[PDB]
Amino acid sequence: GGFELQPRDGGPRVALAPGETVIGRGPLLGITDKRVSRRHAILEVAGGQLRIKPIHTNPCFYQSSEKSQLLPLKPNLWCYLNPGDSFSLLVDKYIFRILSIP
């Protein structure tokens, strides 16, 4: 099972490869905002699942599919992202919804 990221604003989908992908300020997500680290978080696709680990002092945020609040993630800990969940690299910007691929 694979995954894509759907920006909450409706922009193009972001394909994720198996394994670990460093995300943040860079070409993959297109983020240029200096408040976002070039090494902001790790995404891991493995065994049909996706998890994220923040690796910067500037935080990441997580919104379960059933809730309606972007909550801050604890640093350097893994959090699984289910299809329909969202995460963000700023409190109110660069938000991405998780989509599953067959």
């Binding site: 300020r25 860079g26 240029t32 200096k34 680290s37 070039r38």
Partner: peptide
Amino acid sequence: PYAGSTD
């Protein structure tokens, strides 16, 4: 456009 130090 992705270089430079983080705030």
